[model samples]
Target: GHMEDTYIEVDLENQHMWYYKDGKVALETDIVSGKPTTPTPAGVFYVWNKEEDATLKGTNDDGTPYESPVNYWMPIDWTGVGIHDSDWQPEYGGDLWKTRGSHGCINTPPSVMKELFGMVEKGTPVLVF
Candidate 1:
């Protein structure tokens, strides 16, 4: 992957993540967020690292293999408030997203994530405002 300064944005309402360079769109995709009751902490965050050959790394309430992948881990303003992929679901709207997936961290298509993982590095700027 080509190395370049990357910018990111996540919209809780839309459940999407967008990547940019020099004000031009680079990557964009859908994602699942955290529960509203225990919502994803937002604000400026740094790209923690690029997890290679990684998977959801967790499991469901039943202790099953976590369906989501924990890719770029970013520290959102609060402790443990970073972006990660897990079987957790958003707690907004109704009980829908709740039974679906996510917990604040932006999620990318597994294929897209591999592409992104190759590009990002530790301590990269990741504005999640």
Candidate 2:
């Protein structure tokens, strides 16, 4: 049942993400994607895993080491690209990701993420384009 009826479609160009439940739009919101230099990949994938209350360890734009806290972690690939909540972003809805973006993760509002986490499951299809 999970494979037949749940999916997430990300419109990178428009900075929007749609979660489809039972083949319908269940949730939709603006999102911050990867930067131009470290752009988010465009392809089809599925949720390989998800974690709550985890730390994200990576590098910033200047190649400096950094680690931050996150409430959600959904990795689609082995390289650590996924969707999670951002305490760093203060604004939403626009071309923000072009200049100020992530190391390659989808940053969402904590409130929205709270609701989204319960709606999604492992193997949930994710289409990025």
Model 2: residue 108 alpha-carbon error in angstroms: 1.4
Best by TM-score: 2
lDDT of 2 by residue, 1-129 (tens): 337777765677888766678888666777878888888885665665555775777777678988868886666765345676676787667867887766776776666655556777777776556
| Candidate 1 lDDT tens digits, 1-129 | 223556555555666655565555465655655555555555566666656544544444445664444543444344344444332332323233345545435544444444445555565555543
Best by lDDT: 2
Query: What TM-score, over all chains together, does every model reach?
Result: 0.61, 0.82
Go through the candidates in order and give each one's C-alpha lDDT: 0.49, 0.70
- Alpha-carbon RMSD, each predicted model: 6.1, 2.7
Model 1 local distance difference test score? 0.49
Count of clashes in candidate 1 = 8
